[PDB]
Subunit: 353 residues, 5 copies
Amino acid sequence: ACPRPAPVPKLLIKGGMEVLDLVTGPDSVTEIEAFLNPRMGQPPTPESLTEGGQYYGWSRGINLATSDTEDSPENNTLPTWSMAKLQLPMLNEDLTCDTLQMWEAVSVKTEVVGSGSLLDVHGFNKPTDTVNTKGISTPVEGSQYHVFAVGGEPLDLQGLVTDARTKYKEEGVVTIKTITKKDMVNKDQVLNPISKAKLDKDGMYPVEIWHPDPAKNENTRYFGNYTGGTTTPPVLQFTNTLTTVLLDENGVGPLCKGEGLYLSCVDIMGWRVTRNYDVHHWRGLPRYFKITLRKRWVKNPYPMASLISSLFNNMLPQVQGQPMEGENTQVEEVRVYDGTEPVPGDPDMTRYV
Amino acid sequence: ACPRPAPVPKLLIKGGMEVLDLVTGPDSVTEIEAFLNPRMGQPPTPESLTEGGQYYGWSRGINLATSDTEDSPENNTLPTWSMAKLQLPMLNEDLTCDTLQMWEAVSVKTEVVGSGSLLDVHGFNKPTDTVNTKGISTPVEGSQYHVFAVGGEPLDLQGLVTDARTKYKEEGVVTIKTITKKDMVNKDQVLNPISKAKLDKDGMYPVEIWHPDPAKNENTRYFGNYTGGTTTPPVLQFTNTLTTVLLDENGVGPLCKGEGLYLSCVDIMGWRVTRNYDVHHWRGLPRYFKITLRKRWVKNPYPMASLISSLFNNMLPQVQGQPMEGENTQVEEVRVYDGTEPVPGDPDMTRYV
Amino acid sequence: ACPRPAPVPKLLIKGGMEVLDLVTGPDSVTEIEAFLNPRMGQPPTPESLTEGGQYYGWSRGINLATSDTEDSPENNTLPTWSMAKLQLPMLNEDLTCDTLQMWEAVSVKTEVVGSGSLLDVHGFNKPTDTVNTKGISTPVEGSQYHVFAVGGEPLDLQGLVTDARTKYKEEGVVTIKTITKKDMVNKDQVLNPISKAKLDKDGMYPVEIWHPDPAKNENTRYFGNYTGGTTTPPVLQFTNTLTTVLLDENGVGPLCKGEGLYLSCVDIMGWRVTRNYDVHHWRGLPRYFKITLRKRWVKNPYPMASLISSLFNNMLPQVQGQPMEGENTQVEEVRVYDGTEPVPGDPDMTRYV
Amino acid sequence: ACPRPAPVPKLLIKGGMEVLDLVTGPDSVTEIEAFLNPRMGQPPTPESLTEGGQYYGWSRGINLATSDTEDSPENNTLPTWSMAKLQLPMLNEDLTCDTLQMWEAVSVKTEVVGSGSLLDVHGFNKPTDTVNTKGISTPVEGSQYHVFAVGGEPLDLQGLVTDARTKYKEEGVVTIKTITKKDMVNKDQVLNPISKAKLDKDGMYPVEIWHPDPAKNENTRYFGNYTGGTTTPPVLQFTNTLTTVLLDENGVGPLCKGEGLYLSCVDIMGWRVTRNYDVHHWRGLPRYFKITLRKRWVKNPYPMASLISSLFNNMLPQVQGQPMEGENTQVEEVRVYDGTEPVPGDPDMTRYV
Amino acid sequence: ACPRPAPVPKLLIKGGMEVLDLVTGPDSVTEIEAFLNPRMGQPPTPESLTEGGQYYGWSRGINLATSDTEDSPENNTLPTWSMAKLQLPMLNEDLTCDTLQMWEAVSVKTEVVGSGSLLDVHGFNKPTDTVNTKGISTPVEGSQYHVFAVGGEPLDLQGLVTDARTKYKEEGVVTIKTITKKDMVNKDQVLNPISKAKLDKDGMYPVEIWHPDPAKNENTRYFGNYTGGTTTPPVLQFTNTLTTVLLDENGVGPLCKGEGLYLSCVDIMGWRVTRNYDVHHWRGLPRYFKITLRKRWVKNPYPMASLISSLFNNMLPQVQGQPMEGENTQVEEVRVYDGTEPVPGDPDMTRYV
């Protein structure tokens, strides 16, 4: 006799991360809304807007090379990767019949926030009438670079650079020399399979050195786009309604290793030009993530009965011995036999080219 | 024996908002056509086209900063948000079996009107042959910014700015300082979760400070796009035939809280340049909305038997006491028990990192 | 025993409009191919290519404003709307059981013709090497504006302008002052719901004043796009194979009121620059329409037994009396009762805000 | 017991056009791969690369008009249409039950070849540092124009021009004056329904005069796109995998009249600028077609028993007599009666406007 | 009683190419991840970053032509094609019932790596303020050219050039003169069906001479796009989630001839400009391929009982004799008869035009 409203998913509880401390069930869905600020040059710590003008959100400046051979980019001028790790609660286990529950990033709604800010055409930027210093304050223009990644483990990065003779500072930034303790080689200018790293720190990996690794990220979905030039107009489309599916060919999506969910981001909008000279502070805007996660039963990867193994590995000493791994390995050959075949003829035949 | 025309929806009555005073039924559909004018600088009140030339639809001018440290943007030069609230009639209630009827925005047909106006190449604008002051009057160019929102409650805004040392006037405009009574901090240049507001006024929230909040608007669908630059050609596509679906993942769409339907808009097309100097009045065009609404049975959110509660709250005094909420809350812990579990071991275990 | 060709629609007769004088049947389909020439400045009448060079297809020139306050655009420089009305034959009627047959525009294939003409880089236009007057004759560039509409009644236009102090000539052009006999107000610069008109004349409504009305055209499908700038390259895609569906949400499409089918068009490609000065004649190309129509049984809208009413209205005089309509109406209230409700309490309750 | 490979269409024979001399059957499919070279100015005949540098593939130059009134475009500077006709074999006929077999173009895979050639930045073109004549040789830029057509009969062209006072040479080129023996009128600058032609010659119809006729081509599918400007960067996308469907609304596609298949093409990429002056040779690239054809049973259009008619028409003389066709026709009225209707009232009623 | 995880494909073994030495089965799927470095000018061999600055990844420079007639492009300045061949293992054969197994490229995931590197605006490039040599180091801009191909045989190339009087070096590069031992003709500037080659070498075929052949590649899927200009901003979109289907109309995709899988690539991003002059080194980025292959049963193409034939061909001498093939062939006619037709009339009738 009464009207029936339409069925919608029932919201049990909402709030902060504390809400995740409620044991819900196997088919419960969790939506986490977070944001990442642009780690582009100036750090957030000196909150006083008088040191230089609080370039938080911008770089500190830019210094061209003094000659073809020595370049020092002055870390507070290099835009870097933003990252965060959301720590989710633990789930059920099934040690009897080896099986485990973990979080599974199902969808993401992402949005770059604050593009209207670039409609600020007053201010002390290089004017449009440079001969009379009037007109409007030139807005942000130039190269744009928008990458975001959602994963269950830190984003794998690959090292690739322009001029490999660049001398980056050796602290406060993670470069190729920091990972491979040697210098940078010419192969670092195209693709070196050894210039690999992970995005564990925030504000430390510059985006002009470290790019999302295409060969590696299998628990991570990353989306990026680049636009070059010096006066390229920025373009941003924000919307409440579009969502990205994080599922893969098998319909799984990023499983949160351990219990963490990693968000990586960089959103460079272009440059600002000052008035006395042509200093070219970068501009970056924050990114909003809304990740929709569910619970999935997976097969337990670790036979943590290997604790016994760990036992025999902590009590037994650390031996060096002679190389049995690497390139100078002294292992000649390893063969594995399982069944019984008919007697072969010449047993050593392969691809014959 | 007679031919049968095709069945179409039957139009009961059409006219103004007065038409909504007719009790129609549960499956009646209502289409409301309205428009919003650009609140870009000059207000509509001085209708005389002689004060400065009636910049209604344009800004009053633009004033660059006098130095890096003091910026005063002179409110009549800041494009702001346009908003309107259409008041719909009341619907049925079901106090016996708690249930209520409210309006539900199902679709919207929106269109920016007057793009052909920008084909006016006569007039006293900066000519294309600046050395002989001939050619054509330079048309509107520059940064474009098109946002529109349809919701059941006012659009939630988030504060984000360029230079945070800007000194906006303290009346006739709503800035971040107006909402958070303190000054603007460096965090206001990237993302401060406290610089939140709502779009209740019209012509008061500048679009260079206030952006659609991605974390908040759940009864509101907003669509925006930005294009930077100084000479970027405007691009507009108007059409009679395209319509936007306002339904969400559950197939609901914006429910009109109370009975109001909120339309928010900003459509900046670029700048005009004057002749004697390079003054850079903004340009904005009106937006036409056609919202298609139906009636939906929902579950009554308020147990307005809480009127009794309101009773005990109006008679009982207003106490201050000691803080039990906030950050200096003196509440140590709150526990909720409902059922009976087996006796746990250590009852305090969480995500272990 | 014979091979069977595939069934295709059978062409009864083809030719000119005379062909429509053949009574075909209820499920016959008619395809009409027509074209509209650009009404952009110079009229077609002085066919001699010696007056100024026969700018037919171009404007006559351009004259910037002499000051901020007086602008006279010299009608032969304003691009205007092109329109045509194709008169279709009468159809059957069903006066016994009130029902009528009318034409129904089902599809349209449209195409702007002559874009290759803009590959004419010889000629006396402003050269690309302006210091030596060599290179190529600068081709057509600038703002483009492409609108076309197919309807059963004339296209409804809405008035919107740039500077409202512009003094358009009072004959040979239809402006806002022509429709509303007063001058233009500041509201005419954003949106005035009274600056409405219809596209009945051809070459008389300038496209910088009159835009397709979004609130009105319900028997008309219009499609437009605008591109600003001063040197924006034109872009045109012509094709034999694409067709636009004119049906609406109910699957009807434009019904031809009376028996006419109205085609409206404007296709501005940009400007040409002359050599001695920077005169900026517009350029426009013709548009080809191929409209596919069928017959539809509709419900007869007019109870032309109201001829009797018309009787009593032609014999009875024209009275003025006191205002019963308008804003100064002397009608206090009108109530309509049809059935019998239970006795209400307070009968005057509405939306309570 | 053996594995079964997947079924694919069986290739009977491949080679040149000679292969088509094999009577295959009714459901055989034929794929023909051909190419068309750009007929842009310089003809292919003087193969020596010393006359001027062998501009084959480019124009010979460009000559601006000497005044507003006399323009002579010097035929070897006008890009023209490329066309070819592939002659297919004859098929079966069914004179007993009137029916005929003809070829039917079902799909096309087309591709512009040689876009990488425009990466040649060495050479004697206008440098990028014009004050020191260094940098790179400016690559091809400017207006691009890409049209291709596949049909069963020659492509129908419509005449449309810029300035109609242009004096084209009267041999080696087909202009509007060549088809209509009179001069060009102002109507030739917008749309003259009499400036019609067909694409029978190759390298003779300039693309700045002759455009694909939208009203005519019904056995031809044409696709074109134009991009204006003077420095517009070329854009080309070549791919092995995309194919265009040539079928129409009835699912037929171009039937090869007689037995020929007509390919029409023009691919202009922009200009090259020389060094001593700003001569602006055009650039064009070849186009590759891969047309997929099948056989279709159609109804025989000609009752070639009309050979008897042709008999009585070759023996009987050629009379002039008085005009019975045209505009001065002396035929007053023609009426056709077939059945018997009830006696009408006024028999002369039409569309009453 | 236990939860069931979702079924996913089971990974037998992963590692290097050695992993392919495991006989898996008929429905096993193999995913190979590889990369190709840009072969753009400077070779990889002089690894010392002191010769000129290690332009590995860039060209060595650029030298304009000294006159219209002599051009020498200095091989280390020409971007060339990158290629690789992955050698896969041998599969099963079915000599009894003629049938063979071969690898079949089913999908590809490709990505250009290192676009963020172009955000390096420090360094010794031409500054943006050229009058004060300040601002930023101009980033990579200009013509972009992105082609990639996946096939079972080497990519077939077609020769097409700009100026055919260019004198390329006769070693270290493969030009049209290298393949056709004669010089280049004017036909080489549009399309010569004899200027064909194959991509067997890497870093030897310049992309300004050799383009993917549209008539030839049937076991190869290639995708390319070109963007001209001198300051065109680069645009790159990298993503983890998109994959290209290599299957064709029959649903087969590239079959690996022999056992090799050929990857071809070129990714030019634009130029870098130096400071003292306007030298214009190219820029190229590596490409990552992830090819997904399966096994397919095909029909054995070679009747290698033709070994017997090969027998009679190695023992029998090499005769010259008189031409029986070519253009001066002395074979008059070859006829093939198989069945018995009714006696024809005139047996020599063909397409009659």
